[PDB]
Write a protein that binds this ligand. Structure first.
Ligand code: FAD
Ligand code: FAD
Lengths: 314, 314
């Protein structure tokens, strides 16, 4: 019988764990394995906007520090994916590949789905023409005077397209719909730039090449008409998807799948708290996710206390 | 003409500065001087719950790192108190002891008022019987089998009183009103404990002693009747006061003086954003203040952009 079970090992999950462990709750953390232990910062290079690191810190080193801190203060860390939760009963039921636990309270910190398309040949060209971060990778020798694609039509994606025109001979911006979702300034900047072609009503079937990317198999999203595009790079500027499937149908979600929260972390289910990118439609930073993890942990501790649910030993 | 002026050098102010500087806004930060540069963490010993520091970090070292990071990315840092702001005109007017600036946007991150009473003899016995942090200081040799006072009747204060009964022969809990504001469990724990006396309707006039604290001059808050209390220690477990006087009468405040915010950081005045303890009635942690500073900076950047207020050079 757990006081609290935390799901996720991003900055939200680990900050929640540090607060819950320091309150003597002996949190259990399902960190993920197939979901990617350590969250989105494991996939970046250098973090420069996490306060307390004036020299910068690698994503992996920052997340390693957070894990060590969680462990130091008494967190039980499982490198296991949660397969199923039951929030309709009390105590709550949490099932991983390896074990089933009951818990007086649950912190869900499952973040965003992986920034990738899942194309058949995606793993083939990963780091060999395909990149999920144009800012991290755009200046690489591979892309110097290349034709490249940027996937998406949002604010991030138009800025990423313009950035990459510093290095690439030509940028093909690939938009699913008829209209970019970026600001009109960003649109005038893109539609002006002589080194950007915007493809509207464009989806991606697969990537092709040899030892590295040589192009994309595309289709019109209205008619399915197919064509090929020769590019030596592809950057993902795709939108944020909250990873809420564990709780879909059990807590209130908005239209995009974000968990709805009150008072910083409270879900529609008493005793269930959300932290991080899972409910964040605005900021999507490691520092805001960490603050959110703290709010969920303090929220869980006050819920456990008010209901007299904490025991001396588990 | 500033893009943004930040007031305060706590985790909120410096995190805002890092985000604004990295967005190329060349923020100016009025860090404070008489107000205490570096915020509340300058007054603590070891910080253990700021994610990314598994070994712990001193308050001063963590705040030194944040200052260096703010400076690295292009913040203009002034060790100056803001004396007056005018938020009724645009551009906004900000006046320090040394200069007067105009700004398209303002981030107020003025935090909490100093944790002290201002008693005439307070500076005399500071670190010599008077402490603002029972958790930091309770285990000190000075307090071993001493009679000590804890000021306040809140949740923090009752927990602090119980903590200090591990070390002190007797704890006098000094409450201004007739009732503790702590939970009924905390009250039963306190009123049970044979080593705690609760003084209701009790205020503090001054401290007395020689090279160290020997007691308090007290008064009944209903009649003003005076008495003396012999103690060799006094711990401040007093409540949180938001330092909102700069903006009092110019932005909407709640009854306790907290700035009212919408969408994470927006005040009642468009272009004016709040971050940190100044608007936080719930969490009051360095990590939640830092996340808040990020939200205010991103909010200011989007306001400046939407209104086309940013220039190439200032
Ligand atoms: C390329 C890139 C660069 C970035 N750079 C920066 C930057 O420099 N600075 C910055 O502030 N932000 C940056 N971000 C954003 C930042 O990484 C996120 O805002 C932050 O990591 C979100 O934290 P989180 O804890 O909410 O979620 P996530 O980081 O998404 O973590 C969610 C965690 O939950 C786990 N999980 C999911 N489902 C399950 C399950 N069923 N069982 C168990 N565990 C599960 C996942 O494996 C993961 O560990 C970047 C993002 C990316 C993709
Ligand atoms: C003893 C103690 C121990 C603590 N320990 C911890 C802990 O271990 N972990 C934790 O997470 N939290 C801790 N906290 C809480 C934490 O310090 C605060 O939550 C946090 O510092 C608030 O950040 P902030 O930036 O909102 O405000 P503050 O830290 O209060 O900073 C406000 C800043 O604004 C400045 N300012 C005020 N008025 C003006 C003006 N007119 N002009 C210019 N500048 C001005 C002040 O000088 C100060 O620099 C502790 C607090 C105390 C008092």
């Amino acid at each position: 019988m757990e006081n609290v079970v935390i799901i996720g090992s991003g900055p939200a999950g680990y900050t929640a764990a540090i607060y819950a462990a320091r309150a003597n709750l002996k949190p259990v953390v399902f960190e993920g394995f197939r979901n990617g232990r350590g969250g989105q910062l494991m996939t970046t290079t250098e973090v420069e906007n996490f306060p307390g690191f004036p020299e910068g810190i690698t994503g992996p080193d920052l997340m390693d520090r957070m894990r060590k801190q969680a462990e130091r203060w008494g967190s039980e860390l499982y490198t296991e994916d949660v397969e199923q939760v039951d929030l309709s009963v009390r105590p709550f039921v949490i099932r991983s590949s390896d074990r089933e636990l009951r818990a007086h309270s649950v912190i869900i910190a499952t973040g965003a789905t992986a920034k990738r398309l899942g194309l058949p040949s995606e793993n083939t060209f990963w780091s060999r023409g395909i990149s999920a971060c144009a800012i991290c990778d755009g200046a690489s020798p591979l892309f110097k005077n290349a034709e490249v694609a940027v996937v998406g039509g949002g604010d991030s994606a138009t800025e990423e397209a313009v950035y990459v025109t510093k290095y690439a001979k030509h940028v093909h911006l690939l938009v699913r719909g008829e209209r970019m979702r970026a600001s009109k300034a960003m649109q005038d900047r893109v539609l002006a730039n002589p080194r950007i072609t915007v493809h509207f009503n464009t989806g991606i079937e697969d990537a092709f090449g040899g030892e590295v990317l040589q192009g994309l198999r595309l289709f019109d999203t209205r008619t399915g008409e197919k064509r090929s595009l020769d590019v030596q790079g592809m950057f993902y500027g795709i939108g944020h998807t909250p990873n809420s499937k564990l709780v879909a149908g059990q807590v209130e979600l908005d239209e995009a799948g974000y968990v709805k929260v009150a008072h910083g972390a409270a879900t529609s289910v008493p005793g269930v708290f959300s932290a991080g990118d899972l409910h964040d439609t605005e900021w999507r930073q490691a520092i805001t996710a960490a603050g959110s993890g703290c709010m969920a942990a303090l929220s869980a501790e006050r819920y456990l206390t008010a209901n007299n649910l904490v025991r001396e030993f588990k």
